[PDB]
C-alpha cells in the first residue's frame, strides 16, 4: 500500500482497480503524510496530477488549493482512459461538491456579516432616537404642565 | 448496459467493476425508468439496497428522499465486501455532500428570511419613533413661538 504510489506503465494507468486501491490507500494517510507523498509526483503527467489530487483531497487543504487541484486534472480530462473515466468522474464530482460547499459556506457568512452590521447600525440609531425622544417628551410635558397651571 | 441490475452472485457482488458499471448504467436512465428498476430490488439485502441507491441517486429525487436514501446505505456499510468498500465510500460521500449542500441552501434561505424580518421590524419601529419626535418637536416649537410673541 506504500508501493502502490510508485506503480507506472499503461497497464496501471488504464486500470480502474489500481486507482481504486490508490484512493483507498490515500484515505489511510494523515494530512502531513499525504502532502509529503504528493511532493514526489511533480512530473506534471496526468497520472501524477491525478495521484496528487487523490492524496491532497483530504490533506486539510484550502478551498483555493482544492480549486487549483481540480483545475489541473480537469485540463487533462481527455487523457483519462475510458475504463477509468467513470471512477474519475465519481471522484471529480465529490471534489466539485466540496467546492460548492465551500462557496455556500462563504456566501452564508457574508450574508451573516452584512445583515449584522446593518442591524447593529440601525439599533444604534434607534437607541439614540429613543433617548432623544424621551428628553424632548419630558420637556414638553414639563412646560405644558407649567403653562396649564399658570393660565388657571 | 441492461440486465446489469439482474446479475447476482458472489463473483459479481465482490467485483468493483460490476458496481462501477451499475453506476455508469444508472446515469443513462430517466427517473421513471430508474424507479421501475429500483422497485425490483426492495428485499432489504445490501446488494439490493445498494442497487436502489445507485438507481434513485440521480433520478430527480428531493433532499427529503435523499436524506432517507442516505440513512439506508450508511447502515449497510458493514456488509459491503472489502474490495468494494472504497468504491462505496466514494459514492456514499457524494450523496452525503449533496445532502449537505441542500441543508446549507435551506440554511441560507432561513437566514435571508429572518435577517430581512428583523430589519423590517426595526426599520418600522424606527420610522414610528422618527415621526413621534417630529410631532413632539412641533408641539414644543408651538409653545416656544406663543410665549415669544408678546402680542
From Swiss-Prot, chain B:
Source superkingdom: Bacteria
Membrane topology per record: Lipid-anchor
UniProt KW keywords: Cell outer membrane, Lipoprotein, Membrane, Palmitate, Signal
Location relative to the cell: Cell outer membrane
Any single Gene Ontology cellular-component annotation: cell outer membrane
Disruption phenotype: Mutants are unable to form pedestals.
Job description of the protein: Involved in the regulation of virulence and metabolism in EHEC. Required for pedestal formation in host epithelial cells during infection. Necessary for translocation of effector molecules into host epithelial cells, but is not involved in structural assembly of the type III secretion system (T3SS).
UniProt protein name: Quorum-sensing regulator protein G
